[PDB]
């Protein structure tokens, strides 16, 4: 693992059903030369994989997301802004984590729970179990 700029946010508390939007940014050659992707760790429980871009091709990437999160988490690039985003529409009881951001040679890598920078402080998620009814 090697030290690689890391800024992660997004995170926050929401109600079950509701929504956030994650950003992981990094430098500019590390960005588009590695797969980026998005991992989570919930008390008690293993870090896990959530969601992965593979490295740039000439003109594009391709995506993965974890099955438990199919539909709901969309992950993308905006390449102008160096930035990996996680779109979780829908949120459950059961994605509350701090959630990561990391890089690989290659999504196969990161889909296995693979990683090779060291990771930085997270973003914290809180679902919750609802809201007041009006």
């Known amino acids: 693992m090697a030290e690689v700029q890391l800024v992660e946010s997004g995170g ?3 109600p079950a059903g509701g929504s956030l939007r ?3 940014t990094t430098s500019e050659r590390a960005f588009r030369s590695n797969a980026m992707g998005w991992f989570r760790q919930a008390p008690g429980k293993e870090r896990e994989f959530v969601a992965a871009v593979s ?3 000439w003109s594009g990437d391709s995506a993965v997301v974890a099955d438990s999160v199919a539909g709901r988490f969309t992950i993308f690039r905006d390449n102008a802004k160096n930035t990996v985003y996680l779109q979780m529409n829908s949120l459950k009881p059961e994605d509350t984590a701090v959630y990561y951001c ?3 040679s290659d999504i196969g890598a990161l889909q296995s729970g693979a990683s090779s920078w ?3 402080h997270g973003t914290q998620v809180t679902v919750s179990s609802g ?3 009006q």
């Open 22 to 24: 994650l950003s992981c």
């Open 55 to 57: 490295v740039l091709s």
């Open 118 to 120: 060291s990771w930085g």
């Open 12 to 14: 926050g508390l929401v």
């Open 102 to 104: 990391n890089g690989a």
């Open 131 to 133: 809201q007041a009814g």
